[PDB]
C-alpha cells in the first residue's frame, strides 16, 4: 500500500476497471507536472475507504459508483468539488446530479454503468426478449450440451434488474427526500422477480453458486449462450473470439429489466494535502477525450459522462445498448443507506437462491438486515476538528484587540468551533460542523453573549456552552 504524501497522488479504483490505462494518464500528468501518480486496486476498497480516511490516511482520489459517495460525504470524508460552469457543461447534467449531495458536488462523474444482456450469436442468433422464454431455451440448449444463461448470482447488482422489473426499488422518494422506513422489496413485483430467479435454479436452468468468475469462464468458452455483465467485461470476451452481441435485457411480465445504474465517479479525500493537484488531474487530464480513451483502451468504460467522447463511443452498438439499458433502469440513490440496502439484498438473494430461506422469509429479513447496518454508517474522523482547533488558537493570537465600544465576550474555541469577540446581548451564529454524520451542516449553531460581555453558560452545569441542538434535531 502506497501512502498519502504531499506532492504526489494515490488513486484507488476497482480491479475490474482499466487501472493500467488510468496509470498511463498518471504518467502523462507526471511528465507535464513532475507529480507522480500511483494507481492501486485494493480488494473491498469501497468498504475500506471510510475507515482509513477517518484517521487521515487512504488515497487522494477514490473511484466507485456514486451510490457509495453519500455515506462518505455524510461522514465529512470527501472534499467539495468546484468545477466551473464551462467544465460542468461538458458532462451530462444527470451525471452531476448523481454526485450532488446535500447541495454540494462530491465527485467527478466518469462513466455511466448499466448491465446488458450479452449473447453468443453462434449459439443464439435471436436472443430472447423475455425472461419467461429462457427455461424453454435452456431445455433446447441442454440437448446440445450447452445452457441458456449464466451470470453472477453472488452480488445483488446483477440480480437486481429482474427484482426491480415489476416493482422492486431501494427507497421511496417523495416531497424532495428519500423515506428510509422501508426497503422496496415488500411488494408483489419484487417477490415475483426473485421467485422467477429461484425457480430457474430449482428447475436446474441455473446454479445458486455461480459467481462472476464461473459465469465469465462459461460464456467465454462457449458453454452458455448468454450472460449479464457490464462493459468492463467486454475485453475478455473479445479475447475469447466468441461472436457476441450486447443487447437490451429481457423483460419480465412485459416490463423492462431495470438495472440500478451507477455513475463511476472520482472523489477527493477530505484529508488529502493534494486537493488542487487532484482537481487538475481529474479535470484537465482524465476528463478529456484523450484521458478517457487511455482508460477505455485498457478496459472499456462503456458509456461515459463526458459528452464529446460519449458521442464518439455511441457509434458502437454495444454502447447504444448500454445506454438503452441505463435509460430503462434507475440511477441509484446516493444516500448513506445504499450500502445497507445492498448488504440486505445480498443476503436475501443468496439465501433465497440457495434455499436457506423461502422468498417470503428472505425478503422479510431484508428490512431488518438493512436496518441492522445503520449504526455502522457512523464513521467519524478527528482531523477536521483538530485543524479547526489549531487555526482558532492561532487566529486568537494574531487578531488585533477589540476596537468596538462596550462590554463584549472574548474570542474562544468551544471544543468544536471558533468564535470571535462578540458584542453584549448578541446571539452569534455559524454553520454546524460536518464532524458527525447525524449533523446537518446547513443548520446553524448559536452562541449567546449575555448582557455583561460573558458567554452563556448551560444552567445544568454552569459551563460555557455553544448551542449545537439544531444540528441534529429530528
Amino acid at each position: 500500500m502506497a501512502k498519502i504524501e504531499e506532492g504526489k497522488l494515490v488513486i484507488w479504483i476497482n480491479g475490474d476497471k482499466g487501472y493500467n490505462g488510468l496509470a498511463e494518464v498518471g504518467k502523462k500528468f507526471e511528465k507535464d507536472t513532475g507529480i507522480k501518480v500511483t494507481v492501486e486496486h485494493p480488494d473491498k476498497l469501497e468498504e475500506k475507504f471510510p475507515q482509513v480516511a477517518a484517521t487521515g490516511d487512504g488515497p487522494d482520489i477514490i473511484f466507485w459508483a456514486h451510490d457509495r459517495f453519500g455515506g462518505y460525504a455524510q461522514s465529512g470524508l470527501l472534499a467539495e468539488i468546484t468545477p466551473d460552469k464551462a467544465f460542468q457543461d461538458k458532462l451530462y447534467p444527470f451525471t452531476w446530479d448523481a454526485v450532488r449531495y446535500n447541495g454540494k458536488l462530491i465527485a467527478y462523474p466518469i462513466a455511466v454503468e448499466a448491465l446488458s444482456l450479452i449473447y453468443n450469436k453462434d449459439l443464439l442468433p435471436n436472443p430472447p426478449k423475455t425472461w419467461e422464454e429462457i427455461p424453454a431455451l435452456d431445455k433446447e440448449l441442454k440437448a446440445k450440451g450447452k445452457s441458456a444463461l449464466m451470470f453472477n448470482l453472488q452480488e445483488p447488482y446483477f440480480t437486481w434488474p429482474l427484482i426491480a422489473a415489476d416493482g422492486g426499488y431501494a427507497f421511496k422518494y417523495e416531497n424532495g427526500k428519500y423515506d428510509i422506513k422501508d426497503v422496496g422489496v415488500d411488494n408483489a413485483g419484487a417477490k415475483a422477480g426473485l421467485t422467477f430467479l429461484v425457480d430457474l435454479i430449482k428447475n436446474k436452468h441455473m446454479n445458486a453458486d455461480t459467481d462472476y468468475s464461473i459465469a465469465e469462464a462459461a460464456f467465454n468458452k462457449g458453454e452458455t449462450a448468454m450472460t449479464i455483465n457490464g462493459p468492463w467485461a467486454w475485453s475478455n470476451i473479445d479475447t475469447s473470439k466468441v461472436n457476441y452481441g450486447v443487447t437490451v435485457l429481457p423483460t419480465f411480465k412485459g416490463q423492462p429489466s431495470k438495472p440500478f445504474v451507477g455513475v463511476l465517479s472520482a472523489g477527493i479525500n477530505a484529508a488529502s494535502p493534494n486537493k488542487e493537484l487532484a482537481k487538475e488531474f481529474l479535470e484537465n487530464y482524465l476528463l478529456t477525450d484523450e484521458g478517457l480513451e487511455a482508460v477505455n483502451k485498457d478496459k472499456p468504460l462503456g458509456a461515459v459522462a463526458l459528452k464529446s467522447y460519449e458521442e464518439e463511443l455511441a457509434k458502437d452498438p454495444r454502447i447504444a445498448a448500454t445506454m438503452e439499458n441505463a435509460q430503462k433502469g434507475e440511477i441509484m440513490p446516493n444516500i448513506p443507506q445504499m450500502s445497507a440496502f445492498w448488504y440486505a439484498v445480498r443476503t436475501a438473494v443468496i439465501n433465497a437462491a440457495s434455499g436457506r430461506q423461502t422468498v417470503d422469509e428472505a425478503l422479510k429479513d431484508a428490512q431488518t438486515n438493512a436496518a441492522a447496518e445503520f449504526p455502522f454508517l457512523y464513521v467519524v474522523g478527528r482531523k477536521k476538528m483538530m485543524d479547526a482547533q489549531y487555526k482558532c488558537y492561532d487566529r486568537m493570537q494574531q487578531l488585533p484587540a477589540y476596537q468596538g465600544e462596550g462590554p463584549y465576550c472574548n474570542r474562544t474555541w468551544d471544543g468544536w468551533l471558533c468564535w470571535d469577540d462578540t458584542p453584549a446581548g448578541v446571539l452569534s451564529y455559524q454553520f454546524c460542523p460536518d464532524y458527525f454524520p447525524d449533523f446537518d451542516p446547513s443548520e446553524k449553531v448559536t452562541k449567546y453573549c449575555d448582557e455583561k460581555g460573558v458567554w452563556f453558560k448551560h444552567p445544568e452545569n454552569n459551563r460555557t456552552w455553544s448551542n449545537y441542538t439544531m444540528c441534529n434535531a429530528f
Binding site: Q74, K177, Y178, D179, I180, K181, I335, P336, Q337, A371, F374, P375, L377, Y378, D414, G415, W416, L417, F436, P437, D438, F439, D440, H458, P459, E460, N461, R463, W465, S466, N467, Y468, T469, C471, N472, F474
Partner: peptide, 17 residues
C-alpha cells in the same frame, strides 16, 4: 424516516461543547 434519523445520536446537551 429521513436519512439522518437512522444514525446514532450525537450528544449536544450540557457537558458537550
Amino acid at each position: 424516516l429521513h436519512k439522518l434519523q437512522t444514525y446514532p445520536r450525537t450528544n449536544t446537551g450540557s457537558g458537550t461543547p
